[PDB]
Design an enzyme around this catalytic site. Structure first.
Site, short mmCIF file in Angstrom:
data_model
loop_
_atom_site.label_atom_id
_atom_site.label_comp_id
_atom_site.label_asym_id
_atom_site.label_seq_id
_atom_site.Cartn_x
_atom_site.Cartn_y
_atom_site.Cartn_z
N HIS D 17 6.83 -5.34 -1.10
CA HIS D 17 6.74 -5.23 -2.56
C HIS D 17 8.13 -5.25 -3.16
O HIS D 17 8.39 -5.94 -4.15
CB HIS D 17 6.05 -3.93 -2.95
CG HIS D 17 4.61 -3.86 -2.56
ND1 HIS D 17 4.01 -2.70 -2.12
CD2 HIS D 17 3.64 -4.81 -2.55
CE1 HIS D 17 2.74 -2.94 -1.86
NE2 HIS D 17 2.49 -4.21 -2.11
N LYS D 41 -10.46 9.25 -6.44
CA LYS D 41 -9.63 9.58 -5.29
C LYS D 41 -9.45 8.35 -4.41
O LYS D 41 -8.97 7.32 -4.87
CB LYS D 41 -10.28 10.70 -4.48
CG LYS D 41 -9.40 11.93 -4.31
CD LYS D 41 -8.08 11.58 -3.64
CE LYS D 41 -7.18 12.80 -3.51
NZ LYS D 41 -5.87 12.44 -2.92
N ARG D 90 1.25 -12.77 1.25
CA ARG D 90 1.64 -12.46 2.62
C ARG D 90 0.45 -12.49 3.59
O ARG D 90 -0.69 -12.71 3.17
CB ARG D 90 2.36 -11.10 2.66
CG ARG D 90 1.62 -9.97 3.36
CD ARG D 90 0.52 -9.37 2.51
NE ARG D 90 -0.63 -9.00 3.33
CZ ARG D 90 -1.61 -8.20 2.94
NH1 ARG D 90 -1.59 -7.66 1.73
NH2 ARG D 90 -2.63 -7.96 3.75
N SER D 127 0.13 -1.99 2.14
CA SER D 127 0.02 -0.55 1.94
C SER D 127 -1.09 0.01 2.81
O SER D 127 -0.94 1.04 3.46
CB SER D 127 -0.27 -0.24 0.47
OG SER D 127 0.80 -0.67 -0.34
#
Lengths: 157, 157, 157, 157, 157, 157
Positions: D17, D41, D90, D127
């Site tokens: 990133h 959440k 990516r 991530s």
């Protein structure tokens, strides 16, 4: 009032092509296999041979006929009084390019293109690879109709 | 201090290319369309024609200029005092290859490449397919700027 | 003796779906839109609404009918006395998965699946993305039939 | 008058990133990193943490700022007075989906999306995968900025 | 009783190829690099040069040997008393075609093909692109072994 | 000194998996099938069942053993004293994701991943689709080993 065209160079026709012919034949009243011409050489079999191999390999499909294609496929399609093209998709198919041509064809002539996946067992056969392998000594007889193997064996030898 | 280069053979420029030019022009202070040269023939229009067609098709883009590219695109880019390349992605684009070139270009010259999807309506047009269809009698006038259609009609006839 | 089934959740039907319905309707004597059921909730519109929106959006297609699908699509297809499924392919389509299902379906029931590219202009619309955008305030009215926009506007508000 | 937005959940921000942030920062006068919120959440770090990690990881980029995104990205973009979105591509990127969103976004708000390939070395980091590996004991410190590793190590332990 | 063959034209061998050689060498008792011949010209380095560059670049791999391939790869493989082919996959790889060849090869000779992703850093290098860039003045020395750079520099000049 | 691990949930193992097991077994001295655990439920068969089905389906492979995997696959691999993972690629495979994991795995543990295409005939089978079809009444017995069909038939009924 239904019909579809299956265009290609069929040099030579493979069992993957025949599978597509059979499936198109089961879904449309009339199917026309359009054998595209070659501007000069670079092809393995001449037009007459290609036509013969296709006809000999499709005797079990009464609603199918073989004809020689000239010019734009869409022009041939509309000349046959149809608006559908049926093409098989298999391993090695440049499907991104098939999409481009399908939309270009829809744009210029209103002709639809229906794609169908080839049977798993014939998914890796292509006229080009069959010839390359055959040329170098490989046996691709299980991937081609007998009328083609007969002629392929004779070409060599 | 911003600028981008849009490289290509533009033989001929299409409306898909123009769409990309417009979008690059809206995001960068200066845009340079780099027309790559052809080692001999095999191309349809000569350099002068290609330049003219692009200029005539971009009169509404004041911050854009057309120049002839020579050698590596990255060398041209750095000669323009820029470090960005803008390329459109569309149906038929060998985007896997574009990725290879983008990273090779970053590696050798530190030049960035930004990709943008072409408008849906121009997604199936390419200089190559437009020519092929035009050659065989198909009307691709709605996918090319008028300065190109004018010349394309004249080439034929 | 020809017919095709266009299966889906159509929650809600989009103009991309309608384009596919129209093209299937032009190539097959009979087309049946099979609306698949949802085990519980998680869907936006209930079955009755989905059926209504599809019927209201297909009044111009006389040889097309809407029915609720239950169980395996192939079982529904054979119950309709057909052996063909027509599905559209567009931006975001998990076409690799469509290929898996097509062959699985051929394997278990002998049912053929014909794919067709959606019109370029409707290539980025999907029921899911249309809902997501609509939910967050975006106007997707140009990508959905009016019978759907009417209901979508009412759901909100 | 140029600017671009880099939207994402950045939970947590990775070096892939940051590479994208740096490249956008080099080509646009102003870059805004838009951290999207999470409805409940299911995310690892809270908004404040995500913001901090991004700010701490971008001190070397003076023309870049971090802000919290709400609603449609295009609405955020136009609120920033911009019309460009910059996203990295990516290994693992559902680029087919990115194309769908880019065109949907162009359609509803006239916002352009420019894609850039991530550096080869950060091409396999995401991530999600970084968290999964970190959770199970794997060391992904070389793929994340130190401000993130610091916090990631503390979360565990 | 294990062994694998790494076939290719290696014109010239790159560090991406060497990475693949190293990994195959770590997993199989014996590795044979099969350098395919060129029917006439169109290649940059002759067979002797290609062999030399590969040998010089693989001195650290004791269980690896270089040999010239003739005819079908599967025939070469079985002549080596093996049934495995190891190929690297990288940016620009026509992996769809590799799949076709792998299955064709399994079909005609029972030979297995194992694919491995190249290291991220060598993912954009290919013999073809390295040559193209080198030809136009670009420095690709960091992507090729020194025995190759030495010869490449000498070819030019 | 060679060995490979074939990781997966095998819920249940299919003939596509067995084909991969056989091919890995033919190329490596030792093969270990690592059955990954499920955090709670959502799986169809419990660990003991999965192990049994795999063992019962691999009696013809003497150099293969089944073990339960825990944590990162690379940790399991290195615990087995190996550095290779063998995975099959088939229709529906998210091969882009497999590439991401392969490189992540190489990065964190130096473990290599070798991919092999599944046999054409088993290219459309997946544990997930086999279950979905089986659940809805479809017969997928020709795509699963008998030890699995036996148990699958018993689950239903």
């Amino acid at each position: 009032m239904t019909g579809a065209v299956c265009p290609g160079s069929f040099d030579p026709v493979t069992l993957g092509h025949v599978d597509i012919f059979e499936r198109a034949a089961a879904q449309f009243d009339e199917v026309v296999v359009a054998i595209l011409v070659n501007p000069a050489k670079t092809g393995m079999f001449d037009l007459d041979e290609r036509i013969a191999m296709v006809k000999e390999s499709t005797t079990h499909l009464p609603n199918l006929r073989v004809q020689v294609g000239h010019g734009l496929v869409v022009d041939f399609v509309r000349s046959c009084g149809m608006t559908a093209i049926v093409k098989g998709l298999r391993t090695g198919t440049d499907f991104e390019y098939e999409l481009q041509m399908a939309q270009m064809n829809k744009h210029i002539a209103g002709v639809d293109t229906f794609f169908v996946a080839t049977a798993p067992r014939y998914s890796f056969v292509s006229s080009s690879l069959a010839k390359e392998v055959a040329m170098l000594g490989g046996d691709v007889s299980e991937l081609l109709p007998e009328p083609v193997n007969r002629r392929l064996r004779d070409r060599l030898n």
